[PDB]
């Protein structure tokens, strides 16, 4: 995935509700730092829905791929308001960008 394109998608579609830096603030959504290989509902300091918490999955490329295409389908009852990125290549670019950013 194109990490630069992925960063722009993040800035346009996710930054309104999320930070990704270590020690970044919760906004509407939880800070995403350390996302990859973490279970749902794990960011310290954030009020998650039970639906998010009870999903049981680990965030990684495959589960983010499916999640971000249609969040309400993946986690019925999630309070994340987002229709989804329907284009596979835009998801791959975004996720390639998140894999770097949330890790650093």
Please check if 33 is assigned to a binding site.
no
Task: By CB under 6 A, name the binding residues for ligand HEC.
Answer: 13-14, 16-18, 28-30, 35, 40-43, 48-49, 51-52, 59, 68, 78-82
Burial class (CB in 10 A: 0-12, 13-18, 19+), 77: exposed
Nearest distance, CB of residue 53 and ligand HEC, angstroms? 8
**Coil, helix or strand for 101?**
helix
Nearest distance, CB of residue 14 and ligand HEC, angstroms? 3
The answer to whether residues 43 and 26 touch, using CB atoms and an 8 Å cutoff, is yes
Q: Kindly compute the dihedral angle of the four CA atoms of residues 75, 39, 69, 11, in this order, to the nearest 10 degrees.
A: 120
Please check if 14 is assigned to a binding site.
yes
Please check if 65 is assigned to a binding site.
no
Separation between Cα atoms, residue 47 and residue 14, nearest integer Å: 18
Of 16 and 89, nearer to ligand HEC (C-beta) is: 16
Binding residues: 14, 17-18, 80
Binding residues for heme c: 14, 17-18, 80
């Amino acid at each position: 995935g194109d990490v630069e394109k992925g960063k722009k998608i993040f800035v346009q579609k996710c930054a309104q509700c999320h930070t990704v830096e270590k020690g970044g603030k919760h906004k509407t959504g939880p800070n995403l730092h350390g996302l990859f290989g973490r279970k749902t509902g794990q960011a310290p300091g954030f009020t998650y829905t039970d639906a998010n918490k009870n999903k049981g999955i680990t965030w990684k490329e495959e589960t983010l791929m499916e999640y971000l295409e249609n969040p309400k389908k993946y986690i019925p009852g999630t309070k994340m308001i987002f229709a989804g990125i329907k284009k596979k290549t835009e998801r791959e670019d975004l996720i390639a960008y998140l894999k770097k950013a949330t890790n650093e």
